[PDB]
Amino acid sequence: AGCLIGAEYVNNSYECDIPIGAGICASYQTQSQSIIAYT
Amino acid sequence: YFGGFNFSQILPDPSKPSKRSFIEDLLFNKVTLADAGFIKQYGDCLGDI
Numbered sequence: 001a002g003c004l005i006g007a008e009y010v011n012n013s014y015e016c017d018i019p020i021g022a023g024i025c026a027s028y029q030t031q032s033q034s035i036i037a038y039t
Numbered sequence: 040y041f042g043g044f045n046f047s048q049i050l051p052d053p054s055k056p057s058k059r060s061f062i063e064d065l066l067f068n069k070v071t072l073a074d075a076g077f078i079k080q081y082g083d084c085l086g087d088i
């Protein structure tokens with residue numbers, strides 16, 4: 001759905017907190033505080 | 040062996056990259072689609088082909 005700037009892509013899988021696009025979600029977690037992006 | 044019933048046409052198969060069944064593939068191929076802008080398309084629209 002475009003590209004995402006400011007969020008790291010992690011190789012994990014959680015519940016969808018903030019829905020971005022086709023199967024990609026973003027969330028705020030401890031791993032310091034940072035914004036990640038996952039499937 | 041589900042008691043002799045044959046569920047092989049609705050269960051997924053691992054050969055396809057998308058784990059969709061036979062009837063699911065027939066339904067997906069039968070409904071034609073416009074191939075809209077949900078696919079990334081601006082690189083295609085920029086080059087005049």
Ligand SMILES: *[C@@H]1O[C@H](CO)[C@@H](O)[C@H](O)[C@H]1NC(C)=O
Nearest residue numbers: 040043044045046047048061
């Ligand atoms: C189920 O049907 C498929 C074809 O539709 C056939 O190849 C397969 O042998 C059948 N299953 C059994 C257990 O006979």
